Amino acid sequence: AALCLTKRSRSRKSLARTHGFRLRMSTTSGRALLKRRRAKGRKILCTKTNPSSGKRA
Amino acid sequence: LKYPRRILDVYQILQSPIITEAAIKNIADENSLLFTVDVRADKKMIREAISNFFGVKVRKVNTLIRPDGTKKAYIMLNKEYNASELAKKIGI
Amino acid sequence: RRICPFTGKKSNKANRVSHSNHKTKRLQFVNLQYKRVWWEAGKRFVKLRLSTKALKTIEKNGLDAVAKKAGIDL
Amino acid sequence: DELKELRTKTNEQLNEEILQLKGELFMLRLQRSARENFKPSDFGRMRKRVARMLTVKREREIEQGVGKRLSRKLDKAWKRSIVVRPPPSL
Amino acid sequence: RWERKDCKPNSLPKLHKRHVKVGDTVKVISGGEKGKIGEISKIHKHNSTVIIKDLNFKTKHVKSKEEGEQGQIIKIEAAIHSSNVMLILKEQEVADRVGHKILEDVRKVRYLIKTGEIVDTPDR
RNA sequence: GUAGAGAAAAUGCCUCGAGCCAAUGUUCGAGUACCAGGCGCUACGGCGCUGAAGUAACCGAUGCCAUACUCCCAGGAAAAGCUCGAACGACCUUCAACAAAAGGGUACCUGUACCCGAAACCGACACAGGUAGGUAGGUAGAGAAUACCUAGGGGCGCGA
RNA sequence: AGUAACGCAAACAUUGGUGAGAAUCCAAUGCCCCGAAAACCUAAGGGUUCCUCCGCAAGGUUCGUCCACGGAGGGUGAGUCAGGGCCUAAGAUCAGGCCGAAAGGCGUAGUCGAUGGACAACAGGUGAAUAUUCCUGUACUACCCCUUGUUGGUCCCGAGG
RNA sequence: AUCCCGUGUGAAUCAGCAAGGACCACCUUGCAAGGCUAAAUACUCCUGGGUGACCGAUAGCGAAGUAGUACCGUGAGGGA
RNA sequence: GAGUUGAAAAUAAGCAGAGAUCCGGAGAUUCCCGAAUAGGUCAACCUUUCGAACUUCUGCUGAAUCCAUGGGCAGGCAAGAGACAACCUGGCGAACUGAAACAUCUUAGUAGCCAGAGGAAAAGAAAGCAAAAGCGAUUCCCGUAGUAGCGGCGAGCGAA
């Protein structure tokens, strides 16, 4: 049994659907979230992955 | 009608050669030589921008994305054409 | 929606006063109702959804008047 | 020192002159690897000349009358079909 | 050092504007080496700093080569501010304030206010 | 085959009809490489040339025939590819497809490094924790335990 | 308070190196430990840590020439391996449709969604970092090109599987 | 009382109808169930001009340099 | 009106009085995601016959009764779809609180959320107010008035 550690090596793709920008926008509430994350002025306003290669060194 | 996998302008397809000692070894080794292509390139649009800019028929285009974003294209020229003597007019 | 095509008869916002004078909220809404009135100009029925007041009105005033005053048919 | 010639060129000569410009620019980029360094003097000019050609063509397109959307579509029907040619220099 | 970078209206640094021009024959007005003629050679137009030749004496030191060889000292002539230079002509050897005229042609030129000489002179 | 029209679905007759099923097997692939061992160089790695034998008996699988088979009740996913043809549907050897030379040429994007029973992943630490799956050798053993060892890897990062 | 500690009771020892500096780096020789692993791959995750050459300020519970730390260059090549270009399950989104202060809820054909089904590559070399990707040899699949023929198509469709 | 709404009945129009704080008379005002219309008016992420018994480096914007940054959380979000 | 190729210094060649750098009015280009719009999608990607759905316009014209229709099909054009600091209108609309507890009431129709639109919006030209005297569409400030009044006639609310 793993110690009360909440996050495990779950797939990035699986995570993206739950909090993906595409997913975030469809809900009426989700579009609202973007409103705020832009009015504050954040830059990385999601956690996503990309179907090519989710990294640039 | 036939279109290219994408509209990259063709000329913009190749950017610069690679002057590393390893690429020199490949020129002198396989009838290959290395290019550095922008990311939206193919084996069609690179395979058809050397057979129509150097006048040399090409055999393979093994291209690879590179860990920082740009792309890098080993091209194997068909044996009848020889690598180094072609690169000499290019300056390598 | 629960809105009569032929009159903007909405539900009513009304609190139901109790006997101790305790006011709940109790949204109160029209008896608009499924029927199928016989549109003469096509010799044919149409299925509508009608606040009874508007039903009385079509009869008193005919149908097509109600129609253009709301612009509904077809 | 200004180019009062592009406005004299018709469409065709203008066009092939564009392609030839981009070619000779390909070669200039190519020279950087083997460091023949006249480029800074006359690299940007090449680059900064194709723009003139494009600008002239659009104005011409404009008097004649085409929407930006239409022009964009026209450009794509031309970008799509073009074959790389060796530069005139050999 | 951020407190002193060139100031930028939307991608550019403001250029100020100074009366002095390259090739000008100036007298140092006040600062330090007061009263010494000179020929400006190089105008930094964003700070209004102007190096006139052979006046300002800065004794620097330069590590020359990659093995510590040489490194013999150079003596550079550094800036002086623009509000400290007036104009002189050898004929009216005297400081003055600049001015302007529109001569008989279209063009418009300097004109030393206390004398009759013309600062602009020929085009070259 | 024929009977209710192609195609199975159902009917009956019948077929030099008795063999069909599948891992192993043979040959080529490999008259080849590969190789223990030889003789020189060497800033002691490296390379150079040569290079013999390359076979049988045992035991054995937690691979393979294999959704063989038997037995059970609790009765075990779908849709494309793929094979047969009716309103032999728009279209028709000009745009078509098949035996076919298994003849000649061409062959699209994305990942690939490195860790991965982890000092770099998740526990805030270069954390005596945790993390799906794969390979599975010798002696003793019933055994993937245990004990001592090959292959490989390490001696745990304060010492006296 | 220079006090507890220095992260398990696998175990280090030597000679000789490099260097201004060695218990701590390198190479030997020996001892020892795991070996259903303290081995070799691989999904996920990380995301530049990999390699080479300099560096030692801070980091390493000591030291340091050494590092997974700093600096500069370099590196990961597929018709066949994995995914997409094929299919669909759970689920999701659902035109139209219905319902509802608004947002939106239920819902059909469709469209996505693989952890599943269709589908074609192995051995040996090379090399500082890649190799079922590069090289050698032998294979396989799909689409054209050539020949003879039949002229009859491909879809929607109804069936096997 | 006037004023708009849910349910059901459901007038007259000018020798009429509504209001004048239940209602009734007389008088007085206005005449519904159709629509449009500028100004004076409230506001500040802002721009230009000016002013400050406002701050001046844990103050003033959270932010006087890659400040919604580093970092933390799966996420909303927090935040030097 | 001279020197210049953004921040910091070179670097490399350039450009400019046959107006360079630069400052204005109007233009042109404006890769990819994003209303996102060719179709899918883990955003900045893949497959693409190269290009949404809603109105609108022009043509084909289901169903039943070839009626009439609407729906469908196509070629059209190019207008709606997103964004917002606060102010505004509309819909839904709390609670802690005050009442020295608390159910009527008060915080309050405030906060918040959703939906529109504007530089302002909403309101507005009398079936009004008045009072035996007169006014004359709305909207704000002063003041009447913390008065009249309402109110478990309690806390408090409070016009014209």
From Swiss-Prot, chain A:
One Gene Ontology biological process: translation
Primary site of residence: plastid
Subcellular location: Plastid, Chloroplast
Keywords associated with the record: Chloroplast, Plastid, Ribonucleoprotein, Ribosomal protein, RNA-binding, rRNA-binding, Transit peptide
Species of origin: Spinacia oleracea
Subunit structure, as described in the record: Component of the chloroplast large ribosomal subunit (LSU). Mature 70S chloroplast ribosomes of higher plants consist of a small (30S) and a large (50S) subunit. The 30S small subunit contains 1 molecule of ribosomal RNA (16S rRNA) and 24 different proteins. The 50S large subunit contains 3 rRNA molecules (23S, 5S and 4.5S rRNA) and 33 different proteins.
Lineage of the organism: Eukaryota, Viridiplantae, Streptophyta, Embryophyta, Tracheophyta
Sequence similarity: Belongs to the bacterial ribosomal protein bL34 family.
Function statement: Component of the chloroplast ribosome (chloro-ribosome), a dedicated translation machinery responsible for the synthesis of chloroplast genome-encoded proteins, including proteins of the transcription and translation machinery and components of the photosynthetic apparatus.
GO function terms (MF aspect): rRNA binding; structural constituent of ribosome
Top-level lineage group: Eukaryota
A GO term from the CC aspect: mitochondrial large ribosomal subunit
Name the UniProt record assigns to this protein: Large ribosomal subunit protein bL34c
UniProtKB/Swiss-Prot annotation, chain B:
Subcellular location field: Plastid, Chloroplast
Family that this chain belongs to: Belongs to the universal ribosomal protein uL23 family.
Function: Component of the chloroplast ribosome (chloro-ribosome), a dedicated translation machinery responsible for the synthesis of chloroplast genome-encoded proteins, including proteins of the transcription and translation machinery and components of the photosynthetic apparatus.
Subunit structure: Component of the chloroplast large ribosomal subunit (LSU). Mature 70S chloroplast ribosomes of higher plants consist of a small (30S) and a large (50S) subunit. The 30S small subunit contains 1 molecule of ribosomal RNA (16S rRNA) and 24 different proteins. The 50S large subunit contains 3 rRNA molecules (23S, 5S and 4.5S rRNA) and 33 different proteins.
Comment field (misc): Two forms of the protein exist; they have the same N-terminal sequence and approximately the same molecular weight.
Annotated protein name in UniProt: Large ribosomal subunit protein uL23c
Organism: Spinacia oleracea (Spinach)
Phylogenetic placement of the source organism: Eukaryota, Viridiplantae, Streptophyta, Embryophyta, Tracheophyta
Originating gene: RPL23
Residues represented out of the complete protein: 102 to 193 of 198
Swiss-Prot record, chain C:
Signal peptide interval: none
GO biological process: one example: translation
GO cellular component, one term: ribonucleoprotein complex
Cellular compartments annotated: Plastid, Chloroplast
Keywords, comma-separated and alphabetical: Chloroplast, Plastid, Ribonucleoprotein, Ribosomal protein, Transit peptide
GO molecular function: structural constituent of ribosome
Subunit structure: Component of the chloroplast large ribosomal subunit (LSU). Mature 70S chloroplast ribosomes of higher plants consist of a small (30S) and a large (50S) subunit. The 30S small subunit contains 1 molecule of ribosomal RNA (16S rRNA) and 24 different proteins. The 50S large subunit contains 3 rRNA molecules (23S, 5S and 4.5S rRNA) and 33 different proteins.
Role this protein plays: Component of the chloroplast ribosome (chloro-ribosome), a dedicated translation machinery responsible for the synthesis of chloroplast genome-encoded proteins, including proteins of the transcription and translation machinery and components of the photosynthetic apparatus.
Family the UniProt entry places it in: Belongs to the bacterial ribosomal protein bL28 family.
Protein name: Large ribosomal subunit protein bL28c
Gene: RPL28
From Swiss-Prot, chain D:
Keywords linked to the UniProt accession: Chloroplast, Plastid, Ribonucleoprotein, Ribosomal protein, Transit peptide
DNA repair listed as a keyword: no
GO molecular function: structural constituent of ribosome
Protein localization: Plastid, Chloroplast
Paired cysteines (S-S): none
Cellular component per GO, a single term: chloroplast
Keyword DNA repair included in the entry's annotation: no
Source domain of life: Eukaryota
GO biological process: translation
Family: Belongs to the universal ribosomal protein uL29 family.
Subunit note: Component of the chloroplast large ribosomal subunit (LSU). Mature 70S chloroplast ribosomes of higher plants consist of a small (30S) and a large (50S) subunit. The 30S small subunit contains 1 molecule of ribosomal RNA (16S rRNA) and 24 different proteins. The 50S large subunit contains 3 rRNA molecules (23S, 5S and 4.5S rRNA) and 33 different proteins.
Function field: Component of the chloroplast ribosome (chloro-ribosome), a dedicated translation machinery responsible for the synthesis of chloroplast genome-encoded proteins, including proteins of the transcription and translation machinery and components of the photosynthetic apparatus.
Protein name: Large ribosomal subunit protein uL29c
Organism lineage: Eukaryota, Viridiplantae, Streptophyta, Embryophyta, Tracheophyta
